[PDB]
Design a protein around this nucleic acid. Structure first.
Length: 37
RNA sequence: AGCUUUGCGCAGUGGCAAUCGUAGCCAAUGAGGUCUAUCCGAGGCGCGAUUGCUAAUUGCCGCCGUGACGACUUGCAAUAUAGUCGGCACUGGCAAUUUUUGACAGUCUCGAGACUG
């Protein structure tokens, strides 16, 4: 059994997926975990 | 035991300039139709931000000459140099052949010599 989802549920998922990742990386450079880009 | 094809997720590489989102609405109970209408087939409207940055940037080393102190070598004007060494004083002097602060271009001949701008 499978659910599909619409265009607007792709954006929201793609953006809220991307946002969490980049901001988490942002702190890593602040905290000095990661050499600064 | 390899190969192919579809969807999603995570990355690297190339190109394009309108994208993205909606606690708002309408929409297979049919959104939208200039074309063929007993036809087509899925988003449209309204609103707001391409979204964060990076590049940052600007208003103390030599000689000679003179004076004199001390010391040594010898006769002392009661009186200081007869000669040598040590150092101080002088907006003193110093730079066109011999040797450490000054000359280049090329040819030929037997380290040297001759010539050619």
């Amino acid at each position: 059994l499978g659910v599909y989802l619409t265009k607007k549920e792709q954006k929201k998922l793609r953006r809220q997926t991307r946002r969490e990742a980049q901001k988490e990386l942002q702190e890593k450079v602040r905290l000095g975990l990661m050499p600064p880009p």
